[PDB]
Amino acid sequence: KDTWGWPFPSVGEGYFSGAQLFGVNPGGEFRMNGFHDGLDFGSIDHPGSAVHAVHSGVVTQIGYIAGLENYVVVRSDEYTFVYQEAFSNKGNISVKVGQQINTGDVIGYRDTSHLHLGITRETNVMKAIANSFNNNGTWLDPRALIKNGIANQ
Ligand SMILES: [Zn+2]
């Protein structure tokens, strides 16, 4: 019941650079509006191969949009989770649309320099993605969410 976990559980929370953190941070000025709509887990700072689901849900979408590259969308009762940029091709994704997943289940295998994790209450993922650079409450801080979720389970 509402379990949470980190995507690379041997590292757990670990540490993030200014650029990797959610929101508007020193080091993130290179992005539009200086806003980062997710949390980046680098292969250096958060080592590991298998990307573990941070929360239970159902896989609603697997697609490709340059920038997100290959991505997986998982929807729970309250949240939409986007796992993006980790997978150099769709063959690196382990799950299929319609699949019920539990916290810790492998989404796929990261073979790029990072996973970007995005979390939103928005149900229309494309609309949320249209707000990738807008600090308007669409996207939530995954670090704070996972941390609080783990503490409260
Ligand atoms: Zn990112």
Side-chain angles (χ1 to χ4, degrees), residues 2-95 97-126 128-153:
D2 212 63
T3 63
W4 286 83
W6 297 102
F8 305 95
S10 95
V11 192
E13 184 180 345
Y15 309 100
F16 302 93
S17 71
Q20 291 173 320
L21 290 168
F22 172 89
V24 183
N25 303 287
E29 298 87 358
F30 70 96
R31 296 186 184 95
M32 274 182 68
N33 311 139
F35 179 70
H36 186 216
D37 69 341
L39 183 60
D40 291 347
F41 294 80
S43 60
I44 298 159
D45 45 283
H46 292 74
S49 185
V51 175
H52 291 82
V54 303
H55 191 272
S56 303
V58 62
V59 179
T60 54
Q61 193 177 305
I62 300 174
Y64 177 86
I65 292 163
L68 290 77
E69 304 308 303
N70 300 288
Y71 65 92
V72 181
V73 183
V74 176
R75 174 78 197 172
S76 68
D77 273 320
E78 207 172 352
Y79 299 109
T80 304
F81 303 87
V82 185
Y83 302 79
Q84 70 187 55
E85 297 177 77
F87 321 108
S88 71
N89 70 103
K90 281 165 206 212
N92 273 239
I93 298 165
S94 300
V95 294
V97 172
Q99 191 171 334
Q100 303 288 343
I101 67 150
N102 288 321
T103 306
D105 287 355
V106 176
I107 299 299
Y109 294 82
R110 179 186 53 193
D111 62 343
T112 67
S113 65
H114 70 293
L115 163 74
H116 170 117
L117 175 65
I119 303 176
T120 180
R121 289 183 207 261
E122 177 61 62
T123 234
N124 181 345
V125 79
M126 288 302 167
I129 295 163
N131 285 278
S132 294
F133 304 102
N134 294 334
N135 187 21
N136 65 350
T138 298
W139 295 99
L140 312 170
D141 183 353
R143 184 167 71 162
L145 245 64
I146 292 157
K147 213 171 158 46
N148 197 65
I150 293 169
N152 285 292
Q153 71 200 19

